[model samples]
Target: EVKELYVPENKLHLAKTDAETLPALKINKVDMQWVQVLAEGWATPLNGFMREREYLQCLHFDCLLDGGVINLSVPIVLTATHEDKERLDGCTAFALMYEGRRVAILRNPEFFEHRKEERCARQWGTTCKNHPYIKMVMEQGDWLIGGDLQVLDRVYWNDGLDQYRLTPTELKQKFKDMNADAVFAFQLRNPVHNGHALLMQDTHKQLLERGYRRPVLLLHPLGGWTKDDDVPLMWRMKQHAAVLEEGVLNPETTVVAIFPSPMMYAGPTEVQWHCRARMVAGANFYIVGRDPAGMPHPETGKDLYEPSHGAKVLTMAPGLITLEIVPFRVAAYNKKKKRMDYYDSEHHEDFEFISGTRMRKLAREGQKPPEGFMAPKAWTVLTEYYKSLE
Candidate 1:
């Protein structure tokens, strides 16, 4: 049984406040969504936004506070427009309003200015505006305010997918109920394909063979906001269920839950963030795959991170890792062996590649993906979804 990370709640006393009287801080949609993630324990150990010092440390050294490691990897800074920052200056406490409603309270605001380009280059390793996340950071305010937050109610949204959304607290308790002694988490933003299923199965098999009894797979898919081209959450959930029914994963020993934290696409740094979140979700083993959280450069068609970037960083900083890192070797269909194996250049000619881009294009054209690329049931779900779009 794993003891989950400390999730702060009821930390600050909530006092009655008339909305009309207090100074309100308006936060943008993405930033507000992250605030909720911090409050709801998805980003455990991060109670509120990161101040400038913490942000700087996170940018330079992967959330190493005071030169010692912590769970924080991505900087969760609450940014506001220059006009809003100036108007809300000197306010000790203010209502955090979103869409004309108070969602939380910010206390003891710590305000500072950040050099956007410098921070982006340090954090993302690139300052190119074409990078989706870099573009997002650049568009945000130069000034940020960090402090503790008192969330008024549930942080998660009820956008018809509440049934699949599991908080860290809820997921941890569920693992206990299932008597799961070991939990291996697989994180993905895309729909599950045969290759993904094979990778997860191998990871679980390796764990059980290595003495981890009662190991359960956590199908923790990212259900929160993602890049525009990513699949929608509802459809992704449908694909998950389809694969479950198709026995791609044994439903009896698997838990399909939605990870509510938004994607940062920060590559190696994001590997840290993802691992920490999985640990908080009661996972003892994390399946670290190739180019984890990597994005491709728009124009150059080059990978933003090296294929083994996540593995190298985690290997270098083993002390910083809490969960046992299970290296998920990239799986491809080996036609010669009639099984999935790690992609190797020496046997490249003997293997057939499963491409997500090709599958997506085929689905868009109302054509079925090639055999062995995906389970028939899973492919049907995606194909039908694409047809609906037509």
Candidate 2:
């Protein structure tokens, strides 16, 4: 039987704000994204940005200030320049603006200076600027503002992929409407490949074997900002649509949607964030593939984390209830077997590997991928999308 999962409530209570009267603080792109999630209860139990102490604890431990109340692995802090921090002096509350529009209100705001060096070192395991995420962290300001937030406007979505961008509340309602007892969510940032499709299919089969009735496969791809090289949401959505239309996934049992959270690229720690968000979004099971949220070094061509790092940490983390973590076996196309199989050295079978890096290059050069590496429908969509750009 699928047990009821706990969904945390949005801490930011709604209240009408007089934008003309209150002092305002302008936030960046990242801050705007955080504000959206905080208001929607996706990162629930977290009312606003963490203070210095709370931020430090989150970096070293999974729990926040009132330990065990909220399982937070990464810090969602709001930073401001020294000049900007000075403007908030003697103010009990302030309006937060994104591109000059009032979006939220910060109440009882607390100001503090964060240890960027310590934070980067601890959270990312490296302070090298060459690491894309570390470089982003380095670019942030020295001071931070922490407080309870009340969002005035909550609805936000990707322009072209609006239909797929469902909030935690919306997705839960979707499962209810489908009369689904269990849902398996697959977190993705890149284009879907054969291996990823195989994993999704196998994971769904495992759920049925475990006695789940009317199981649903939720394709929850990240719809917010990502690293520069990642394909945009519209293109990726088209690819997904192709695969679904091609019957690569069982359309009857699958639910394709977009997760609005931005990528942190924090490696192992991000797995916790990813899984927690999905659980709140009503996924009873989450597929943790090898190196969940892994990133490579810019120049060295080496991974920042171990291959099994995310899998190991999630298994040992505490306080996750009602959501089961399912291991995703490494899959590859076995030429001899003429089908995708769980990769095993003992099988002694001829196999072919599809590298995402190589695939991106081929797409850029207006070349199609090797046969069997990409689904025909998806390939056609990607090829045409890139061709139009040329």
**What's the number of clashes in each of the models?**
0, 0
Error of 2 at 380 (Å): 0.9
Q: Highest lDDT, which number?
A: 2
Candidate 2: regions farther than 4 A off:
1-16, 65-69, 347-349, 361-367
What shift in Å separates residue 94 of candidate 2 from its native position after superposition? Answer: 0.6
Candidate 2 local lDDT, 18-124, one digit each (tens): 54468998887877877767766777767676777778777878766474555678888888878878888678888888887887778888888867898888887
Q: 236, model 1: CA deviation in Å? A: 0.9
Candidate 1: tens digits of C-alpha lDDT, residues 259-321: 877798888888888888888777888888798999888878789889798877865553245
Which residue window of length 10 is worst by lDDT in model 2?
1-10
Once fitted onto the true fold, the runs of candidate 1 whose alpha carbons sit more than 4 angstroms away are 1-21, 64-68, 318-321, 337-339, 364-366
TM-score, cand. 1 vs. native? 0.92
TM-score of each: 0.92, 0.91
